[PDB]
Design a protein around this ligand. Structure first.
Ligand SMILES: Nc1ncnc2c1ncn2[C@@H]1O[C@H](COP(=O)(O)OP(=O)(O)OP(=O)(O)O)[C@@H](O)[C@H]1O
Lengths: 735, 34
């Protein structure tokens, strides 16, 4: 006869039928899906004592491989086949156990934190069980599902055991994040939030979903640190980075302070060794947790473009060069300002100085654009001062090259990140941005690894799905649901370094990111390149921002008001709707729609629970969990492809059925101009910096060589519309 | 037409019925007004 080994353990004879019925359960309510297809696709090789689990495993990958553009449903087909396996591999049976029962069981197993069993009585638990819709597990697109089977779900990494379920996960987080809340609104918010996230209406950072409800108390994602030219300072930075990379966090180092090579030390008793020696160390620290240095530990370093070693620095990400002259494991962000670009357009030179050979030259760069301009020329025409002249047209050129050569050298216009920042340039000047490039928060160096003064920008963020809200108004609820819930994490997550805790509790900066922007612009006909979305964008982002400030301002009554709020310009009555670059009105004529003055005063009177609520960050996993489009950048193709642990993943762009025409794929774009114009608009409302990336296609350029002209031209375009930063330059590879 | 409309349950069958065997200038820059 024939044999089989049921996951239960017992034996059975092969039942060719039982398979079919399974595929059916999936093909149920689907088209273009051939039940017979997946079978033959899978070449399932039978052999005695084969486990039923493995058998089931085979079809999952097979169905996932048939997820073609012509077969959009297959994406959901395999998804159903997947959800099944998971639930049964963690519950013994297809239907998960009651909220209460489960919560408790996993507690004593070390997996769920008993913290919940104490803040919620059985009744409240069994009640919340009502809100839970296990059936929502059948609303996942396999793309997202596969991710859940790793990062999000609670599981045993050695043994493989999966202890948890897809709505089960959702609800727990909602409550465990609202536990310390009033008896009367607490059950309520627990549901209104659960649905907001369970319905993919509001996606949250990967780190969050996994650990809310487990032992670990840390939600930190991206951090910033400014290093001091002083020997001792660096040593601390070295330690901090390791402490933070040890908890898998992205790093944002600012060594623009290390005093230049040759600079005096102690008078004339010893001359400085340079910035590079300090920079490379920074890299070993971020990799302190990485195997082979291949992956893990992300460090982005920032520095002034007028630095005396600017030329030295550009080379390092390049692979063509001597080891000791290249730090290639980390990204770099060139800092630029208004005078800088000026020199380029005038074919004039750029005097390079050392942060330590000039007084007021640095600080001015970040906060005041006049002083840096007045001071600059002074030393520029001064000979006492170690200097080095280099034609601007000669510098910007080099920089831009490495940017397209690697696609890691970003850009950051300081003046815009200070004249259009919720913070005051004098009081809390922003000197740097994070690995993601989307965070504009104030920074301070640390004398010690645990300096009291030190400030370590800590950013916590959540995202709003534009493809999940029918009208702009719906945001106002989701706004409070996010801002409130988020602000709570700040008091639930422990801070490794003290300089962070203080700097965190102090302003409670909140980063809110929007996703599925591609689907949105398409659902309205508009596109990126024609810019017909310029107005649609202005009106949209105008709202998203308004409601967030109103949600925060409102909380500025319910749980105090911000510790440092005074520093920010918001308290000074300054609004982000009157700081944007005037150049923008020229690409958007969509006047504001929601009374702003109402908040202009309501926030003068009461304050804000946070210092920042608007930022744009590109997220790999938040986007696919909702089957939405990555951040704002349009998809490179209708049939999204990726390698999971299995190595085949397919994600059809939201609604390919009527949406094929309206989608303007990243490569379908004529030029980068269109993209920028929309970005500059978003900035007019973003407290913090959008992760806008530029994309070029050599295949479209005469002699197949992207012209320097175009590259430089674009940079000016961004600066002209008040764009804060630049992100990956990805060229048209695969040819 | 009497039988209900459908999508070929088997597409794998088709296999057998098909045909069986850097530029830099200050020129263009000078003009931009950031
Ligand atoms: N006797 C069998 N022969 C071949 N395939 C089987 C057999 N029994 C189950 N399968 C298949 O393997 C998969 C696993 O089923 P399941 O996840 O429910 O766990 P199980 O141990 O097989 O329990 P049960 O078979 O009683 O449902 C299903 O897709 C099913 O089609």
């Amino acid at each position: 006869n024939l044999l089989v080994t049921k996951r239960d353990g017992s034996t059975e004879r092969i039942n060719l039928d039982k398979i079919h019925r399974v595929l059916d359960w999936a093909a149920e309510g689907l088209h273009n899906v051939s039940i017979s297809q997946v079978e033959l696709r899978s070449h399932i090789q039978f052999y005695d004592g084969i486990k039923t689990s493995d058998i089931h495993e085979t079809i999952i990958k097979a169905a996932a491989d048939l997820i073609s553009r012509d077969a959009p449903d297959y994406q959901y087909l395999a998804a159903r086949l997947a959800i099944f396996h998971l639930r049964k591999k963690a519950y013994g049976q297809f239907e998960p156990p009651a909220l209460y029962d489960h919560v408790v069981k996993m507690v004593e197993m070390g997996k769920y934190d008993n913290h919940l069993l104490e803040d919620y009585t059985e009744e409240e638990f069994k009640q919340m069980d009502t809100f839970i819709d296990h059936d929502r597990d059948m609303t996942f697109s396999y793309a997202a599902v596969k991710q859940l089977e790793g990062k999000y779900l609670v599981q045993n990494r050695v043994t493989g055991e999966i202890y948890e379920s897809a709505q089960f996960l959702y609800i727990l987080v909602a409550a465990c994040l609202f536990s310390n809340y009033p008896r009367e609104t607490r059950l309520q918010y627990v549901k209104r939030f659960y649905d907001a996230v369970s319905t993919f209406k509001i996606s949250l950072p990967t780190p969050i979903m996994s650990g809310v409800r487990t032992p670990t108390r840390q939600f930190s994602s991206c951090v910033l640190i400014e290093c001091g030219d002083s020997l001792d300072s660096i040593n601390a930075t070295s330690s901090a980075i390791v402490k933070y990379v040890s908890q898998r966090a992205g790093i944002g180092i600012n060594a623009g302070r290390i005093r230049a090579l040759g600079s005096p030390i102690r008078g004339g008793e010893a001359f400085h060794t340079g910035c590079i020696p300090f920079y490379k160390h920074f890299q070993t620290a971020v990799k302190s947790c990485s195997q082979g240095g291949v992956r893990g530990g992300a460090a982005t370093l920032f520095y002034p473009m007028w630095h005396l070693e600017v030329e030295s620095l550009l080379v390092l990400k390049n692979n063509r060069g001597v080891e000791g002259n290249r730090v290639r494991h980390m990204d770099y962000g060139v800092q630029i300002n208004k005078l800088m670009y000026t020199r380029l357009l005038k074919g004039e030179d750029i005097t390079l100085f050392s942060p330590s050979d000039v007084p007021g030259l640095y600080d001015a760069f970040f906060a005041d654009q006049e002083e840096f301009e007045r001071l600059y020329t002074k030393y520029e025409k001064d000979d006492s001062i170690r200097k080095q002249r280099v034609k601007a047209v000669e510098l910007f050129s080099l920089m831009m090259q490495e940017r397209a050569s690697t696609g890691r050298i970003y850009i950051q216009n300081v003046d815009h990140c200070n004249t259009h920042s919720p913070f005051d340039p004098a009081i809390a000047p922003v000197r740097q941005s994070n690995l993601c490039l989307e965070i504009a928060l104030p920074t301070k160096p640390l004398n010690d690894v645990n300096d009291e003064n030190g400030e370590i920008a800590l950013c916590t963020l959540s995202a709003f799905n534009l493809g999940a809200i029918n009208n702009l108004d719906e945001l106002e609820e989701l706004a409070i649901l996010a801002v409130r819930a988020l602000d709570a994490l700040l008091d639930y997550q422990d801070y490794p370094i003290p300089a962070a805790k203080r700097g965190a509790m102090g302003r409670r900066t909140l980063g809110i990111g929007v996703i599925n922007f591609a689907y949105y612009l398409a659902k309205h006909g508009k596109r990126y390149s024609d810019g017909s979305a310029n107005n649609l964008t202005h009106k949209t982002f105008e709202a998203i921002q308004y409601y967030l400030l109103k949600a925060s301002n409102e909380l500025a009554k319910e749980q105090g008001a911000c510790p440092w709020f005074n520093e920010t310009t918001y308290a000074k009555g300054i609004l982000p709707i009157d700081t944007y670059k005037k150049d923008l009105d020229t690409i958007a004529n969509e006047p504001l729609h929601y009374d702003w003055e109402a908040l202009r005063e309501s926030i003068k009177t009461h304050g804000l629970r946070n210092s920042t609520l608007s930022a744009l960050m590109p997220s790999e996993t938040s986007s696919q969990i909702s089957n939405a489009t990555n951040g704002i950048e349009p998809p490179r193709g209708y049939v999204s492809i990726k390698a999971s642990k299995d190595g085949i993943l397919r994600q059809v762009v939201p609604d390919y059925e009527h949406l094929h025409d309206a989608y303007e794929l990243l490569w379908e774009m004529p030029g980068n101009d269109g993209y920028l114009q929309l970005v500059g608009i978003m900035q007019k409302f973003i407290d913090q910096s959008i992760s806008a990336n530029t994309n070029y296609d050599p295949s479209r350029f005469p002699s197949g060589k992207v012209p320097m002209q175009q590259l430089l031209k674009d940079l000016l375009t961004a600066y002209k519309f008040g764009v804060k930063t630049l992100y990956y330059q990805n060229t048209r590879d695969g040819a | 037409l009497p039988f209900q409309t459908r999508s070929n349950p088997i597409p794998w069958i088709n296999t057998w019925l098909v045909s069986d065997n850097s530029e830099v200038d200050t020129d263009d820059l000078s003009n931009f007004q950031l």
